[PDB]
Amino acid sequence: VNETLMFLEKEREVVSSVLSLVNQYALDGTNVAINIPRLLLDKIEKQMFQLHIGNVYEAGKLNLLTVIQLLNEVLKVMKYERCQADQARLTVDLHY
Amino acid sequence: EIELLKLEKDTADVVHPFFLAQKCHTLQSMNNHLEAVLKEKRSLRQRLLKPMCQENLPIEAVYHRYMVHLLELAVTFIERLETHLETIRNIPHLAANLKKMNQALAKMDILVTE
Amino acid sequence: RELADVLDAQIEMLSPFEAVATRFKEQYRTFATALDTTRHELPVRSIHLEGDGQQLLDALQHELVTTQRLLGELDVGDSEENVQVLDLLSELKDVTAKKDLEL
Amino acid sequence: LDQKLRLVTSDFHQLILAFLQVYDDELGECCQRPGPDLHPCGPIIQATHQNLTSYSQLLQVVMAVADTSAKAVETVKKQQGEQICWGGSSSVMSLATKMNELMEK
Numbered sequence: 001v002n003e004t005l006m007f008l009e010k011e012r013e014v015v016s017s018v019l020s021l022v023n024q025y026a027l028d029g030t031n032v033a034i035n036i037p038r039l040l041l042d043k044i045e046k047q048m049f050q051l052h053i054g055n056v057y058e059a060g061k062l063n064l065l066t067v068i069q070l071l072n073e074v075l076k077v078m079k080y081e082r083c084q085a086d087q088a089r090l091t092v093d094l095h096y
Numbered sequence: 097e098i099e100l101l102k103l104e105k106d107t108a109d110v111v112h113p114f115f116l117a118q119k120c121h122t123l124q125s126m127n128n129h130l131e132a133v134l135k136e137k138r139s140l141r142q143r144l145l146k147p148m149c150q151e152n153l154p155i156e157a158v159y160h161r162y163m164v165h166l167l168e169l170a171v172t173f174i175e176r177l178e179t180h181l182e183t184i185r186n187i188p189h190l191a192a193n194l195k196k197m198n199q200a201l202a203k204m205d206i207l208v209t210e
Numbered sequence: 211r212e213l214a215d216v217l218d219a220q221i222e223m224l225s226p227f228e229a230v231a232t233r234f235k236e237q238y239r240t241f242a243t244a245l246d247t248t249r250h251e252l253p254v255r256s257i258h259l260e261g262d263g264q265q266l267l268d269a270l271q272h273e274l275v276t277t278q279r280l281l282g283e284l285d286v287g288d289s290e291e292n293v294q295v296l297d298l299l300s301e302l303k304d305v306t307a308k309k310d311l312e313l
Numbered sequence: 314l315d316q317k318l319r320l321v322t323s324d325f326h327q328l329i330l331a332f333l334q335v336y337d338d339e340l341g342e343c344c345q346r347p348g349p350d351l352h353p354c355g356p357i358i359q360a361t362h363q364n365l366t367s368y369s370q371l372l373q374v375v376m377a378v379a380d381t382s383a384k385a386v387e388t389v390k391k392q393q394g395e396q397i398c399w400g401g402s403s404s405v406m407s408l409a410t411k412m413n414e415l416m417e418k
Binding site for chain 3: 318326341354355358359360361362364365367368371374384396
């Protein structure tokens, strides 16, 4: 009995990894509105030759590639803005 | 009584109801897990009918929580970029700010002292 | 007499399982290998289809490799002590309001 | 406990024989295909979902430190904003009257 137990439980664990929360789905996203900051419009009006970003909604449906391109450019702009900053390390004491 | 207690303690591994109780609880744990597996046999054979179909990609329901959460985090990014931009530009994160609160907490402290 | 009785009882409790146990564990090992394979062969990165589904998959893979290299250059921070310090600063804002009223 | 264990092992042997017959008629028969969704395709998946989870906690990290910075700026505005207002004009002259009474000593 002990042998069989030691020979199954880990496998049971990964079964518990896969047959867990198998009842999750998405919801409606049409209620989300758009208030785009105009600096993004400036940046997409600056570099049409390099930035091949399409519309967020084409044919009335969401385009994931274009919005991931937009978040990628947001992260890259953030990267320029933080590498302009000279700070490197962050340290805080919560005991205080 | 020395012999009787000796034979009672020598048989502690299998006879007494304690270890029987723990092996019983392991049995109900195994039975509950395998019953939760077995109740969804039609769902399991629905998983089994999903090979490497590049034309009709077989998404599942466990990963929906991840994609919902990352989509909502993207939405919260797009909603308030401007606040994050003004927050990073005016003052450094927990640097100059961290310093000034330690020196300016002392003014409320001393105000309480008066 | 009583020890032989309880021993005999656990013999008929234990005996039928040992024969089926070998087949049970071998078929469980094979089906767990199959479960590992089918868990290891469910690619989920897609939305409402643009172009082809596999082309959308690979485009998302390339974009998230770019995102992962940008993250690996920029991985700093935590998540729970931020919640704790937010909670305590909110509490001390409340304390500031009450001490002003008390003053 | 004896009745419980015999009933539990009876139902457990029932579950064993059920699992055997389910594997023999439907599960292993699905696995009986000569190409059983070939296992070299298996390790290929270890770039999508684990990376998705990694990106998940990385986004919660980045928003968490962003909210930390926002609350830092808010606390900067509170500390440097001089939250005490000395009660306008009547309270400040009344407080001045308390200090003229205090230096009566």
